[PDB]
Amino acid sequence: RHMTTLSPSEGKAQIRALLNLINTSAEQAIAEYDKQECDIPSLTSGEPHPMDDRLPSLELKNTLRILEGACAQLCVTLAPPAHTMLNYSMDVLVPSCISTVIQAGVAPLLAKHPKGLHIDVLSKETGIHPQKLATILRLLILNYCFQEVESNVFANNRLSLTLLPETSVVDILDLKTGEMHRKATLWVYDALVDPDFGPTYDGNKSPLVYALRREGFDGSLYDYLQTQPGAVARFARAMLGFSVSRGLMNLLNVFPWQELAPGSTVCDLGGGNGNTSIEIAKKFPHLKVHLQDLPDTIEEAKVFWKEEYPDAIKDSRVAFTPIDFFKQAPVPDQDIYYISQIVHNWGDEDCITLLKNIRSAMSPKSRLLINDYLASHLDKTSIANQHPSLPRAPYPLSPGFGRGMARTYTGDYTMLVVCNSRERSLEDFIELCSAADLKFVRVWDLAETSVTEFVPAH
């Protein structure tokens, strides 16, 4: 129409530019589906789309960042503030419903009956009152998870299929919506102003540990998981699925592993089982990988590598060396030292200690890759003056990608309430590395976390 141009203003120009971002991003997402020769996904189909279990392309993830940011900004601009804030206040409800239907096994039950089940059958099988379960299901269905095929007859759709026990994402969805995460957010303010739990970032003083203490539990997160049967393996699968659902394997496509000389060494410092190094070695057979972690984890990793990629052990392309990376330096003269989701778990002093340990082991050919969210400040000046190798949100998105980069900030807050740690900005990382005589090179954007590269300064 003409409503953006009849009585012109800067605000109308910004609305029209948001509309342009939405339209062009949607067309680019269509192009991504065309590139893979796939049709557009359906929210009513009862079977997965071919790309549901595939690594999302970098282009699709960047597109979605812009599309989600622009849609969110457009709606929040045009709606009355009380409307948006009321909806925010009720956003706890959908994750509550997800946890409830996971506990009730609704999605596997519906997978046994793909054409759908009447709500009385679901009630008989779950033990939940049929109208209460229908209330839960309809809130999820309104949000495109499950579907109502006839009145009071419910079926799976492509979003509820992520809740099947076999998928790679059900465990992280179960953990993030689960009772432990709900306890972590139950008394956040009280923990933050508590004279003992408030002032420090100590591991045993998170809001989760505060809630556990307040209910009579003695022990940290670790101990709490150990006391819950089958919960440590649940947490491990959840971490793996958190990496998978976020498309972190796009590392393999962003950093130029193919341009490293044959025989180059990648030291996966603190890589646990080496789930990343194993993919690097599988995809780039000209590289050698070194897994370093705690001795027990190193034995688990030897078994894991024997399971999944014995060829690397037979070819002498994988090596394993135990380490406590706070007390000893890693193996020297590696071409790459890779640390992923390690810095955001420790305070500044321990990080500087680890960074100095890494720096002491490096040669002129060495570099350090840090895989972590970059939790940038949200003022216009910080965003404008960021390093040009960082992705920049297009006009008129603000702050940055807005909701399009939500997981950087929901991640940070999660780190606070569950682990009492924090994500850091690019400036924070540069300052820590500079204290360890490491000079910044550039950011390798994964459209989720970022891989920042540093080299020995002197």
Residues with catalytic function = 344
Tokens of residue 185, six digits: 């957010």
232 binds, among Na ion, ligand ORN, a second copy, none (CB under 5 to 8 A by kind): none
Output the smallest distance, CB 105 to a second copy, in A.
Answer: 11
CA separation for the pair 161, 140 (Å, rounded): 13
Q: What is the DSSP string of 85-152?
A: HHHHHTTTHHHHHHHHHHHHTHHHHHHHSTT-EEHHHHHHHH-S-HHHHHHHHHHHHHTTSSEEEETT
Residues numbered 13-42 forming contacts with Na ion, rule: CB under 5 A? 14
Please compute, for residue 340, the number of CA atoms within 13 A of its CA located in the half-sphere on the CB side: 25
- Peptide linkage before 8 cis (omega within 30 of 0): no
28 binds, among a second copy, Na ion, ligand ORN, none (CB under 5 to 8 A by kind): a second copy
Closer of 145 and 336 to a second copy (Cβ): 145
73 binds ligand ORN (CB under 6 A): no
The closest residue (CB) to Na ion is 179
Q: Is 377 in the site for ligand ORN (CB under 6 A)?
A: yes
Decide: is 376 part of the binding site for ligand ORN (CB under 6 A). Answer: yes
Other C-beta atoms lying within 10 Å of the C-beta of residue 324? 11
Which residue, 84 or 152, is less far from ligand ORN as judged by CB? Answer: 152
CB of 257 to a second copy, least distance (A): 24
Q: Does 427 bind ligand ORN (CB under 6 A)?
A: yes
**Binding-site partner at residue 89 among a second copy, Na ion, ligand ORN, none, CB < 5 to 8 Å by type:** a second copy
Query: Taking the alpha carbons of 279, 282, 283, 287 in that order, is the dihedral positive or negative?
Result: positive
SS3 322: strand
- Contact of residue 386 among a second copy, ligand ORN, Na ion, none (CB under 5-8 Å per partner type): ligand ORN
Taking CB under 5 A as the binding criterion, the range among 140-148, 176-184, 256-264, 267-275 that sits at the site for Na ion is: 176-184
Residue 414 found at the interface with ligand ORN (CB under 6 A): no
Residue 457: contacted member of Na ion, a second copy, ligand ORN, none (CB under 5 to 8 Å, by partner type): none
User: What phi, psi does 207 have (nearest 5°)?
Assistant: -55, -30
Please tell me the distance from the alpha carbon of residue 94 to that of residue 265, in angstroms, as a whole number.
45
Q: How many CB atoms lie within 10 A of CB 321?
A: 14
Q: Which amino acid is at 93?
A: L
Which residue lies nearer to ligand ORN by CB, 212 or 436?
436
Interface positions, 138-167, toward ligand ORN (CB under 6 A): 151
Q: Is 179 in the site for Na ion (CB under 5 A)?
A: yes
Which residues ranging from 378 to 407 are in contact with ligand ORN (CB under 6 A)? 382, 386
Query: Do residues 178 and 100 touch, judged by C-beta distance below 8 A?
Result: no
Among 332, 245, 232, 311, smallest CA distance to 272 is for 232
Residues 183-202 within binding reach of Na ion (CB under 5 A): 189
Q: How far is the CB of 235 from a second copy (least distance, A)?
A: 15
DSSP 146-189: SEEEETTEEE--TTGGGGSTTSSSHHHHHHHHSHHHHHHTTTHH
From the centroid of its chain, how far is CA 193? 29
Binding partner at 340 among ligand ORN, Na ion, a second copy, none, C-beta below 5 to 8 Å by kind = none
- Residue nearer to a second copy on the CB measure, 127 or 364: 127
Minimum distance of a second copy from residue 193's CB (angstroms): 5
For residue 270, the partner it binds in a second copy, Na ion, ligand ORN, none, with Cβ less than 5 to 8 A by kind, is none
The answer to whether residues 94 and 176 touch, using CB atoms and an 8 Å cutoff, is: no
CB neighbour burial string for 407-443, b if at least 16 within 10 angstroms, e if fewer: ebbebbebbbbbbbbbbbebebbbebbeebebebeeb
CB of 448 to a second copy, least distance (A): 10
89 or 151: whose CB is closer to ligand ORN? 151
384: exposed, middle or buried (Cβ count in 10 Å: 0-12, 13-18, 19+) = exposed
Q: Which residues bind ligand ORN (CB under 6 A)?
A: 151, 376-377, 382, 386, 425-427
- Catalog residues that contact Na ion under the rule CB under 5 A: 11, 14, 179, 189
